[PDB]
Design an enzyme around this catalytic site. Structure first.
Site, PDB file in Angstrom:
ATOM      1  N   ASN A   1      45.735  57.521  18.515  1.00 44.09           N
ATOM      2  CA  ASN A   1      46.054  57.711  19.906  1.00 44.09           C
ATOM      3  C   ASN A   1      46.689  56.482  20.683  1.00 44.09           C
ATOM      4  O   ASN A   1      46.105  55.529  21.366  1.00 44.09           O
ATOM      5  CB  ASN A   1      44.927  57.871  20.987  1.00 44.09           C
ATOM      6  CG  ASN A   1      44.952  58.197  22.270  1.00 44.09           C
ATOM      7  OD1 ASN A   1      44.132  58.445  22.971  1.00 44.09           O
ATOM      8  ND2 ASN A   1      46.270  58.108  22.577  1.00 44.09           N
TER       9      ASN A   1
ATOM     10  N   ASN B   1      46.030  54.848  23.960  1.00 39.64           N
ATOM     11  CA  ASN B   1      45.101  53.701  24.568  1.00 39.64           C
ATOM     12  C   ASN B   1      45.158  52.596  24.147  1.00 39.64           C
ATOM     13  O   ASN B   1      44.507  51.556  24.226  1.00 39.64           O
ATOM     14  CB  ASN B   1      43.767  54.276  24.155  1.00 39.64           C
ATOM     15  CG  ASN B   1      43.558  54.571  22.784  1.00 39.64           C
ATOM     16  OD1 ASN B   1      43.896  53.574  22.145  1.00 39.64           O
ATOM     17  ND2 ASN B   1      42.841  55.413  22.502  1.00 39.64           N
TER      18      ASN B   1
ATOM     19  N   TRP C   1      33.767  40.350  21.563  1.00 43.84           N
ATOM     20  CA  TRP C   1      33.759  39.432  23.164  1.00 43.84           C
ATOM     21  C   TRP C   1      33.392  40.708  24.093  1.00 43.84           C
ATOM     22  O   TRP C   1      34.298  41.035  24.807  1.00 43.84           O
ATOM     23  CB  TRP C   1      35.325  38.988  23.381  1.00 43.84           C
ATOM     24  CG  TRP C   1      35.367  38.009  22.422  1.00 43.84           C
ATOM     25  CD1 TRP C   1      34.796  37.212  21.533  1.00 43.84           C
ATOM     26  CD2 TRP C   1      36.803  37.479  22.314  1.00 43.84           C
ATOM     27  NE1 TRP C   1      35.535  36.186  20.831  1.00 43.84           N
ATOM     28  CE2 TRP C   1      36.701  36.537  21.341  1.00 43.84           C
ATOM     29  CE3 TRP C   1      38.240  37.532  22.887  1.00 43.84           C
ATOM     30  CZ2 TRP C   1      37.901  35.745  20.910  1.00 43.84           C
ATOM     31  CZ3 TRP C   1      39.245  37.010  22.391  1.00 43.84           C
ATOM     32  CH2 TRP C   1      39.294  35.705  21.617  1.00 43.84           C
TER      33      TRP C   1
ATOM     34  N   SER D   1      32.170  26.673  31.691  1.00 45.04           N
ATOM     35  CA  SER D   1      31.606  26.731  32.911  1.00 45.04           C
ATOM     36  C   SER D   1      31.976  25.504  33.798  1.00 45.04           C
ATOM     37  O   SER D   1      32.058  26.039  35.119  1.00 45.04           O
ATOM     38  CB  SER D   1      29.898  26.007  32.617  1.00 45.04           C
ATOM     39  OG  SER D   1      29.872  24.731  32.048  1.00 45.04           O
TER      40      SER D   1
ATOM     41  N   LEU E   1      27.866  29.890  20.039  1.00 46.07           N
ATOM     42  CA  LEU E   1      28.579  29.774  18.922  1.00 46.07           C
ATOM     43  C   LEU E   1      29.861  29.626  19.489  1.00 46.07           C
ATOM     44  O   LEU E   1      30.400  30.444  20.023  1.00 46.07           O
ATOM     45  CB  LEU E   1      28.512  31.284  18.145  1.00 46.07           C
ATOM     46  CG  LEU E   1      27.176  31.746  17.268  1.00 46.07           C
ATOM     47  CD1 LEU E   1      27.396  33.386  17.097  1.00 46.07           C
ATOM     48  CD2 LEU E   1      26.687  30.773  16.146  1.00 46.07           C
TER      49      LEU E   1
ATOM     50  N   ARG F   1      24.309  47.656  13.087  1.00 42.56           N
ATOM     51  CA  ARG F   1      24.545  46.461  12.326  1.00 42.56           C
ATOM     52  C   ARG F   1      24.595  45.227  13.305  1.00 42.56           C
ATOM     53  O   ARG F   1      25.512  45.117  14.061  1.00 42.56           O
ATOM     54  CB  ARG F   1      25.872  46.661  11.736  1.00 42.56           C
ATOM     55  CG  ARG F   1      26.511  45.208  11.010  1.00 42.56           C
ATOM     56  CD  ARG F   1      27.655  45.542  10.114  1.00 42.56           C
ATOM     57  NE  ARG F   1      29.039  45.838  10.952  1.00 42.56           N
ATOM     58  CZ  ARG F   1      29.963  45.041  11.091  1.00 42.56           C
ATOM     59  NH1 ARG F   1      29.945  43.628  10.983  1.00 42.56           N
ATOM     60  NH2 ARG F   1      30.980  45.528  11.834  1.00 42.56           N
TER      61      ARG F   1
ATOM     62  N   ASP G   1      24.831  42.032  14.791  1.00 37.43           N
ATOM     63  CA  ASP G   1      25.671  40.695  14.559  1.00 37.43           C
ATOM     64  C   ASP G   1      24.875  39.457  15.038  1.00 37.43           C
ATOM     65  O   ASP G   1      24.055  39.241  15.808  1.00 37.43           O
ATOM     66  CB  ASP G   1      26.934  40.699  15.615  1.00 37.43           C
ATOM     67  CG  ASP G   1      27.892  39.552  15.419  1.00 37.43           C
ATOM     68  OD1 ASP G   1      28.293  39.251  14.334  1.00 37.43           O
ATOM     69  OD2 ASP G   1      27.889  38.749  16.505  1.00 37.43           O
TER      70      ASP G   1
ATOM     71  N   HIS H   1      21.288  33.643  14.860  1.00 37.68           N
ATOM     72  CA  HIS H   1      21.452  32.723  16.032  1.00 37.68           C
ATOM     73  C   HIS H   1      20.702  33.566  17.072  1.00 37.68           C
ATOM     74  O   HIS H   1      20.931  32.812  18.202  1.00 37.68           O
ATOM     75  CB  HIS H   1      22.942  32.866  16.212  1.00 37.68           C
ATOM     76  CG  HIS H   1      23.563  32.316  15.202  1.00 37.68           C
ATOM     77  ND1 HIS H   1      23.576  30.690  14.893  1.00 37.68           N
ATOM     78  CD2 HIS H   1      24.292  32.746  13.899  1.00 37.68           C
ATOM     79  CE1 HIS H   1      24.195  30.437  13.898  1.00 37.68           C
ATOM     80  NE2 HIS H   1      24.763  31.668  13.167  1.00 37.68           N
TER      81      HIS H   1
ATOM     82  N   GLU I   1      23.290  40.336  10.191  1.00 37.49           N
ATOM     83  CA  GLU I   1      24.342  39.839   9.390  1.00 37.49           C
ATOM     84  C   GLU I   1      23.976  38.149   9.698  1.00 37.49           C
ATOM     85  O   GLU I   1      23.729  37.562  10.686  1.00 37.49           O
ATOM     86  CB  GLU I   1      25.774  39.818  10.064  1.00 37.49           C
ATOM     87  CG  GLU I   1      26.162  41.280  10.138  1.00 37.49           C
ATOM     88  CD  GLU I   1      27.741  41.544   9.782  1.00 37.49           C
ATOM     89  OE1 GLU I   1      28.412  40.798  10.271  1.00 37.49           O
ATOM     90  OE2 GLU I   1      27.979  42.693   9.353  1.00 37.49           O
TER      91      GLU I   1
ATOM     92  N   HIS J   1      34.624  41.211   6.807  1.00 41.74           N
ATOM     93  CA  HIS J   1      35.527  40.925   7.735  1.00 41.74           C
ATOM     94  C   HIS J   1      35.714  39.068   7.832  1.00 41.74           C
ATOM     95  O   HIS J   1      36.550  38.723   8.746  1.00 41.74           O
ATOM     96  CB  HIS J   1      35.031  41.478   9.207  1.00 41.74           C
ATOM     97  CG  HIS J   1      33.775  41.012   9.512  1.00 41.74           C
ATOM     98  ND1 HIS J   1      32.695  41.267   9.139  1.00 41.74           N
ATOM     99  CD2 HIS J   1      33.430  40.333  10.784  1.00 41.74           C
ATOM    100  CE1 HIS J   1      31.376  40.936   9.677  1.00 41.74           C
ATOM    101  NE2 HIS J   1      32.194  40.145  10.618  1.00 41.74           N
ATOM    102  N   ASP J   2      34.515  38.556   7.357  1.00 42.50           N
ATOM    103  CA  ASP J   2      34.586  36.901   7.410  1.00 42.50           C
ATOM    104  C   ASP J   2      35.178  36.268   6.116  1.00 42.50           C
ATOM    105  O   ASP J   2      35.610  35.299   6.141  1.00 42.50           O
ATOM    106  CB  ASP J   2      33.408  36.541   8.103  1.00 42.50           C
ATOM    107  CG  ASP J   2      33.123  36.890   9.221  1.00 42.50           C
ATOM    108  OD1 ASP J   2      34.146  37.023  10.282  1.00 42.50           O
ATOM    109  OD2 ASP J   2      32.048  36.819   9.825  1.00 42.50           O
TER     110      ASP J   2
ATOM    111  N   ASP K   1      39.519  35.110   8.096  1.00 45.71           N
ATOM    112  CA  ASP K   1      40.078  35.422   9.484  1.00 45.71           C
ATOM    113  C   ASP K   1      40.996  34.801  10.028  1.00 45.71           C
ATOM    114  O   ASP K   1      41.351  33.219   9.790  1.00 45.71           O
ATOM    115  CB  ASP K   1      38.736  35.342  10.333  1.00 45.71           C
ATOM    116  CG  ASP K   1      38.911  35.330  11.744  1.00 45.71           C
ATOM    117  OD1 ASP K   1      39.957  36.449  12.065  1.00 45.71           O
ATOM    118  OD2 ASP K   1      38.057  35.177  12.577  1.00 45.71           O
TER     119      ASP K   1
ATOM    120  N   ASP L   1       4.180  49.323  -0.135  1.00 42.71           N
ATOM    121  CA  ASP L   1       3.694  48.289   0.805  1.00 42.71           C
ATOM    122  C   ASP L   1       4.594  47.781   1.993  1.00 42.71           C
ATOM    123  O   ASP L   1       5.673  48.113   2.039  1.00 42.71           O
ATOM    124  CB  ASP L   1       3.051  47.111   0.061  1.00 42.71           C
ATOM    125  CG  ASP L   1       4.199  46.491  -0.717  1.00 42.71           C
ATOM    126  OD1 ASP L   1       5.273  46.849  -0.817  1.00 42.71           O
ATOM    127  OD2 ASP L   1       3.916  45.168  -0.574  1.00 42.71           O
TER     128      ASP L   1
END
Ligand SMILES: OC[C@H]1O[C@H](O[C@H]2[C@H](O)[C@@H](O)[C@@H](O[C@H]3[C@H](O)[C@@H](O)[C@@H](O[C@H]4[C@H](O)[C@@H](O)[C@@H](O[C@H]5[C@H](O)[C@@H](O)[C@@H](O[C@H]6[C@H](O)[C@@H](O)[C@@H](O[C@H]7[C@H](O)[C@@H](O)[C@H](O)O[C@@H]7CO)O[C@@H]6CO)O[C@@H]5CO)O[C@@H]4CO)O[C@@H]3CO)O[C@@H]2CO)[C@H](O)[C@@H](O)[C@@H]1O
Ligand SMILES: OC[C@H]1O[C@H](O[C@H]2[C@H](O)[C@@H](O)[C@@H](O[C@H]3[C@H](O)[C@@H](O)[C@@H](O[C@H]4[C@H](O)[C@@H](O)[C@H](O)O[C@@H]4CO)O[C@@H]3CO)O[C@@H]2CO)[C@H](O)[C@@H](O)[C@@H]1O
Ligand SMILES: OC[C@H]1O[C@H](O[C@H]2[C@H](O)[C@@H](O)[C@@H](O[C@H]3[C@H](O)[C@@H](O)[C@@H](O[C@H]4[C@H](O)[C@@H](O)[C@H](O)O[C@@H]4CO)O[C@@H]3CO)O[C@@H]2CO)[C@H](O)[C@@H](O)[C@@H]1O
Ligand SMILES: OC[C@H]1O[C@H](O[C@H]2[C@H](O)[C@@H](O)[C@@H](O)O[C@@H]2CO)[C@H](O)[C@@H](O)[C@@H]1O
Ligand SMILES: OC[C@H]1O[C@H](O)[C@H](O)[C@@H](O)[C@@H]1O
Ligand SMILES: [Ca+2]
Ligand SMILES: [Ca+2]
Ligand SMILES: [Ca+2]
Length: 686
Positions: free
Chosen positions: A29, A32, A101, A146, A194, A227, A229, A233, A257, A327-328, A371, A577
């Site tokens: 599409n 978009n 993000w 910040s 991170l 999944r 992420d 962490h 992961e 992907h990494d 990446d 078990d």
């Protein structure tokens, strides 16, 4: 329905996942597509949006690219709305094309599609017997500063359009403000950021309740798996409470992961997979496969060691998601490498234990460094590559032969370059032979298997230079030559007379929740299900057929139980078990103990009056607790999943190995919240 049905959200072992990096798969599409500096329709700038979307995935599902390959499941980039900022990182513009993000976990990323598009994706996939897994990254929102709120979107978090807060002026403490992690310790990597990503504070009740409400929305949309992420962490205790929220509502296969490097075997990683309520991406498997088939840094003996060790270290090894790249990582296939290396790694993965996940484009022999070079737009949709055919021939076996989906793994022949292993489940058997040496054949004599007498054709049809196998009595194979670079698959299927359990999911939930028990030989008439010594039969067994049982967890005390079944005739099955019955709904509570001095190597743990705290058994105490970031030694803290609203008695322990020192005095006591979080702060009692 059978265990292999697309409707089975609790078991992906009979499936083959296709890892879809949405933006780089197919732009169905153009309308978009992000515009301006955030977009590159040619996909030359791998850090901008290229246009890949959900309509595109729908098209590739309907035109047969995935189904023709034998793919029965896909996972996609995090679907939630991401920031729209175009961030300049040292001269280069970066966008949220990767989906990591987030700004609103209750909305979709418009670039990928609308809620309606997502619904259409779920529908299209299911109509083609393809399950859908979504990436979910509740660890953080987005890049932030910040001191500089104008940077990006300041990591702002919205609740379906309503601003909750940002990284600057964070008086609610929705995020952590402890700097960035250096990965020096697990605790350091959990309570610090991170990169520059605003770290979410799951101890904040708003954040806790918000994220659990968000995942429920996606569950209601029909997703078949999750999944998670960056699970290494986030507080492990909080994640357990998260999985409890999922499982006590609508359980779906979930795995996280947790990166492991070459030669890294992590006890913490094992424990997380064994006790968190989710399994993990099998990095231990992936890294060894690369060493053996790609980088030549170990041989078949190392591959075997990994198979035997992992089968013992992981309580449910069959739930670990296997892969050869992602992907990494740099793509498995190097530019100048022989393609047989990738083809063998694929065949190995597809026939090994766990849940196989193929990174998009692997079958097109894509190459690329780290990446973002490993995230190029898929160059073609050809079904004519050898790799495509390998997947096409082997992927369906996970459905047709339960030995591949649920079987044990046993080495039957081996040397530096050759590994012949056998998968076995009930009467079902599969034998796989792999010769990584591309220049030297191997004489295979003395091979013994569980295959019935007879001649077996290579399932790959000689595609990878495999051969026919001749098995005599006793399962002894006639001498044969395994060609250089040879890979062959021989298999046998037959009815299983004895009830045999191959998988159970979910593995953690409260009474009343329905669990799925898959396998063979259950029979068509309702039998009995056992949780420990407790017997369940009749109405609470919602449905029962030969390969699948749906049964409600009985109201037994919280704890760890062995699962077993018996057919209508009373013949008992094998034991599955490590099933954890929760004491009820869960909430994440932070325990803080002050002035607990220790000697180097000695650590503080938490024990208490509920199974979630190990029922006073030091061997099952919670910890080791932390003492650096949020609170500092001699004060220790830890986030723990505990039953909501329950009055709990507890004490802290100091452990050196298995040697235990108890707090003196009377037990501490508190009542857990009915929802949201809480912090219990007490002093160590001598
Ligand atoms: O009081 C002083 C000061 O304090 C505060 O500032 C501090 C920060 O709050 C704190 O976070 C910390 O930030 C610094 C980092 O610690 C430090 O590492 C450094 O970060 C750099 C990084 O080194 C660079 O490489 C670069 O990062 C790149 C990556 O290299 C790229 O790979 C890419 O990444 C993204 C991936 O492409 C995505 O796929 C995804 O990754 C996911 C994986 O795919 C997935 O498998 C895995 O599980 O999860 C991943 C995350 O979901 O996201 C990746 C990250 O976006 O792109 C990034 C972005 O370029 O850049 C970063 C940022 O520069 O430098 C940081 C800044 O110093 O320390 C700060 C100072 O102490 C206050 O905020 C400040 O106001 C105060 O003045
Ligand atoms: O990877 C990080 C490390 O994690 C673990 O270390 C933990 C310790 O095992 C545990 O005992 C505790 O450590 C505290 C000490 O118990 C306490 O005595 C004191 O340590 C003093 C030390 O006695 C003194 O000789 C030295 O000069 O100063 C130290 C103070 O800095 O405080 C310690 C905490 O600061 O907690 C540790 C985690 O924080 C693993 O055991 C370790 O192998 C890892 O390297
Ligand atoms: O299910 C059986 C019992 O369970 C519960 O008892 C648990 C306690 O509530 C809990 O505190 C803990 O007990 C430990 C003590 O807290 C700790 O001080 C120490 O006790 C020592 C004592 O310090 C020492 O002076 C004395 O000589 O020996 C004691 C040990 O015998 O260790 C205790 C653990 O052994 O764990 C208990 C379960 O093991 C219920 O409260 C109780 O009613 C049940 O009978
Ligand atoms: O014959 C039983 C025997 O088969 C396999 O042994 C192989 C060995 O792996 C090869 O490297 C070579 O030495 O030939 C042997 C068979 O003659 C199994 O590995 C072994 O455990 C088993 O007993
Ligand atoms: O060491 C960095 C990485 O280099 C290569 O990509 C290897 O294949 C991989 O196993 C390793 O982790
Ligand atoms: Ca598009
Ligand atoms: Ca975190
Ligand atoms: Ca087990």
């Amino acid at each position: 329905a059978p265990d292999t049905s697309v409707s089975n959200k609790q078991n992906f072992s009979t499936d083959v996942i296709y890892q879809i990096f949405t933006d780089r798969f197919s732009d169905g599409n153009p309308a978009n597509n992000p515009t301006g500096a955030a977009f590159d329709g040619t996909c030359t700038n791998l850090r901008l949006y290229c246009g890949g979307d959900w309509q595109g995935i729908i098209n590739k599902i309907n035109d047969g690219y995935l189904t023709g390959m034998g793919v029965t499941a896909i996972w996609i980039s995090q679907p939630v709305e991401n920031i729209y900022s175009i961030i300049n990182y040292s001269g280069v513009n970066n966008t949220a094309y990767h989906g990591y993000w987030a700004r609103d976990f209750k909305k979709t990323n418009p670039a990928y599609g609308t809620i309606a598009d997502f619904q259409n994706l779920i529908a299209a996939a299911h109509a083609k017997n393809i399950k859908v897994i979504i990436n979910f990254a509740p660890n953080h929102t987005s890049p932030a500063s910040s001191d500089q709120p104008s940077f990006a979107e300041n990591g702002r978090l919205y609740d379906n359009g309503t601003l909750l807060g940002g990284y600057t002026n964070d008086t609610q403490n929705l995020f952590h403000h402890n700097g960035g992690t250096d990965f020096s310790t697990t605790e350091n990597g959990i309570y610090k950021n991170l990169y520059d990503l605003a770290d979410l504070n799951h101890n904040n009740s708003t954040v806790d309740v918000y994220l659990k409400d968000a995942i429920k929305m996606w569950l209601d949309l029909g997703i078949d798996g999750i999944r998670m992420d960056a699970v290494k962490h986030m507080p492990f205790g909080w994640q357990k409470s998260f999985m409890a929220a999922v499982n006590n509502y609508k359980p779906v296969f979930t795995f996280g992961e947790w990166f492991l490097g070459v030669n890294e075997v992590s006890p913490e990683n094992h424990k997380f997979a064994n006790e968190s309520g989710m399994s993990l991406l099998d990095f231990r498997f992936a890294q060894k496969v690369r060493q053996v088939f790609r980088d030549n840094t170990d041989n078949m003996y190392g591959l075997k060691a990994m198979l035997e060790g992992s089968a013992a270290d992981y309580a449910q090894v069959d739930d670990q998601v296997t892969f050869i790249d992602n992907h990494d990582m740099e793509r498995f296939h190097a530019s100048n490498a022989n393609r047989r290396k990738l083809e063998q790694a694929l065949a190995f993965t597809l026939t090994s234990r766990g849940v196989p996940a193929i990174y998009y484009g692997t079958e097109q022999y894509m190459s690329g460094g780290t990446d973002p070079d490993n995230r190029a737009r898929i160059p073609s949709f050809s079904t004519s590559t050898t790799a495509y055919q390998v997947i096409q021939k082997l992927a369906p076996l996970r459905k047709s032969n339960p030995a591949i989906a649920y079987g044990s793994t046993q080495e039957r022949w081996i040397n530096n370059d050759v590994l012949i292993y056998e998968r076995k489940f009930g009467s079902n058997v599969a034998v796989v032979a792999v010769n990584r040496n591309l220049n030297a054949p191997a004489s295979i004599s003395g091979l013994v298997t569980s295959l019935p007498q007879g001649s077996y054709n290579d399932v790959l049809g000689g595609l990878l230079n495999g051969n026919t196998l001749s098995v005599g009595s006793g399962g002894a194979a006639s001498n044969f030559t395994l060609a250089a670079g040879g890979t062959a698959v021989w298999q046998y299927t037959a009815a299983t007379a004895t009830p045999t359990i191959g998988h159970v999911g979910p593995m953690m939930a409260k009474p009343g929740v329905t669990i799925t028990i898959d396998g063979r030989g259950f029979g068509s008439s309702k039998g009995t299900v056992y949780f420990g010594t407790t017997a369940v039969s009749g109405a609470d067994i919602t449905s029962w057929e030969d390969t699948q049982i749906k049964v409600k967890i009985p109201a037994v005390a919280g704890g760890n139980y062995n699962i077993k079944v018996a057919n209508a005739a009373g013949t008992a099955s094998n034991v599955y078990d490590n099933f954890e019955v929760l004491s009820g709904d869960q909430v994440s509570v932070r325990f803080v103990v002050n002035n607990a001095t220790t000697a180097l190597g000695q650590n503080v743990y938490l024990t208490g009056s509920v199974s979630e705290l190990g029922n006073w058994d030091p061997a099952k105490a919670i910890g080791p607790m932390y003492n650096q970031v949020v609170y500092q030694y001699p004060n220790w803290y830890y986030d723990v999943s505990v039953p909501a609203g329950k009055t709990i008695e507890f004490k802290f322990l100091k452990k050196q190995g298995s040697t235990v020192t108890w707090e003196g005095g009377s037990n501490h006591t508190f009542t857990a919240p009915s929802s949201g979080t809480a912090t219990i702060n007490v002093n160590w009692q001598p």
